Amino acid sequence: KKIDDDLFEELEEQLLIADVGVETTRKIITNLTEGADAEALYGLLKEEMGEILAKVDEPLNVEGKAPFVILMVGVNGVGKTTTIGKLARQFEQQGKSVMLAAGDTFRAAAVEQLQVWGQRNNIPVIAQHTGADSASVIFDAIQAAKARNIDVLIADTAGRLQNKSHLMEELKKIVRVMKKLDVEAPHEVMLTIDASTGQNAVSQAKLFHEAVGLTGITLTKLDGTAKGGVIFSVADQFGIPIRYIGVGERIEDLRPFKADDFIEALFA
Numbered sequence: 417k418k419i420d421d422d423l424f425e426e427l428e429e430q431l432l433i434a435d436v437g438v439e440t441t442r443k444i445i446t447n448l449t450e451g452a453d454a455e456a457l458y459g460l461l462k463e464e465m466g467e468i469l470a471k472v473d474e475p476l477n478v479e480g481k482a483p484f485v486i487l488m489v490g491v492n493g494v495g496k497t498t499t500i501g502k503l504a505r506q507f508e509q510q511g512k513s514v515m516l517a518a519g520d521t522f523r524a525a526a527v528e529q530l531q532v533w534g535q536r537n538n539i540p541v542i543a544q545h546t547g548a549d550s551a552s553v554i555f556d557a558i559q560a561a562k563a564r565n566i567d568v569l570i571a572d573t574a575g576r577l578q579n580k581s582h583l584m585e586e587l588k589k590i591v592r593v594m595k596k597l598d599v600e601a602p603h604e605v606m607l608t609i610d611a612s613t614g615q616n617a618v619s620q621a622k623l624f625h626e627a628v629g630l631t632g633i634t635l636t637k638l639d640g641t642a643k644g645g646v647i648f649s650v651a652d653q654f655g656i657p658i659r660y661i662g663v664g665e666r667i668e669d670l671r672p673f674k675a676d677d678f679i680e681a682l683f684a
């Protein structure tokens with residue numbers, strides 16, 4: 417097969433369906449045309465996509481803090497609660513002690529889901545009454561983690577993103593409250609975004625990144641039909657490391673991010 421305008425239009429369609437986005441797709445194609453049979457083109461495209469993801473493939477390292485604090489941010493419905501448990505199991509398998517903070521204080525089901533999971537798995541969960549102050553719950557969790565020599569503290573947060581909610585200011589307050597106990601905390605600000613939301617994750621990454629500064633991303637629900645192409649836009653615009661991929665609903669379904677596999681899956 418030979419290179420022509422039909423192949424570049426074919427590639428654009430495939431990238432748009434993968435949620436790479438209009439802007440990122442346009443940039444990628446123009447770079448592909450300038451950089452440049454069909455098979456060679458797909459080889460070159462995968463290579464240039466590899467160069468994008470290479471800049472954000474740093475794996476998360478949680479060792480050496482007391483505790484290492486992960487602030488979990490994201491909007492509701494993306495898999496934040498599930499991911500926290502998957503992370504907790506991951507770190508415990510590595511021999512680290514874990515504590516959870518139920519900072520999404522107005523969602524009773526989310527709080528109780530964490531409490532019950534933690535109880536079943538012998539992981540302490542710091543929680544207060546429904547509607548309690550998120551910053552206070554997370555304050556108590558850090559104190560308890562320090563008192564109890566916990567290696568990793570994972571702090572959940574609210575995820576209602578509307579002008580009523582003042583979520584960004586709440587997160588900023590949480591961070592300031594954190595730094596009164598440990599100036600290095602939070603050691604990781606982990607955004608969870610849902611592959612099935614497509615390009616809406618770009619807006620979310622922008623909001624959370626501008627408010628508290630993201631240092632890592634978990635992309636969930638890659639096991640659906642969604643391709644997760646938004647990460648190219650986030651990488652190009654923000655350069656935030658992709659730490660993990662969610663590949664299911666089971667507690668094991670959290671995988672370290674791998675650039676090569678992700679690229680192949682995008683075209684499968």
Ligand SMILES: Nc1nc2c(ncn2[C@@H]2O[C@H](COP(=O)(O)OP(=O)(O)O)[C@@H](O)[C@H]2O)c(=O)[nH]1
Nearest residue numbers: 492493494495496497498636637662663664665
């Ligand atoms: N297929 C799939 N479902 C996921 C994944 N991560 C989370 N979920 C699903 O999304 C729902 C829960 O998301 P949840 O953690 O409650 O969302 P939150 O509101 O962001 O805390 C559940 O039905 C989970 O099964 C994933 O990686 N793959």
Ligand SMILES: [K+]
Nearest residue numbers: 638640641642
């Ligand atoms: K997929």
